[PDB]
Design a protein around this nucleic acid. Sequence first.
DNA 1: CGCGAGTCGCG
Length: 165
Amino acid sequence: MVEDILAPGLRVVFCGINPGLSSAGTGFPFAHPANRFWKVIYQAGFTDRQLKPQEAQHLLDYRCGVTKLVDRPTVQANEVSKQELHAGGRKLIEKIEDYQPQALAILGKQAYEQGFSQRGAQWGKQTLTIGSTQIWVLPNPSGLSRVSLEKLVEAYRELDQALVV
DNA sequence: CGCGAGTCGCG
């Protein structure tokens, strides 16, 4: 099982589909060294250095959170049904109403659409909100995505900069 | 008419 990293007052809550088979075992989000997440949020600007999955809890210090749509671990994100994704979204909504982050960031275009029942969603900011929490769709940091690091970084960077203080 | 559903080839 992979515990959530949430707290009130966060500026961003990162959300993935489900745990990979490596992450599941370690009990850390995006634990497999092939997943660009940690490098991306670092380079994007969310952290002052590149954290290891071990230090995940220290994200709160930078006022960032992490969670997932579906708990069931899996090799590839595509093994999770829409049924599971749609249910996952419903529960995510509650956590957001609970912790009330400045922004919810879904890592997966399909994830978003399924989880929130939305069609033809575009990358970036969504008009959809959850109270004061704004919603974003960011490309998945998996090394399976043919999306380049340079692209991935910009995407997240836009959000960071988008959340002023 | 519209609408809502039913893999391949890419680094």
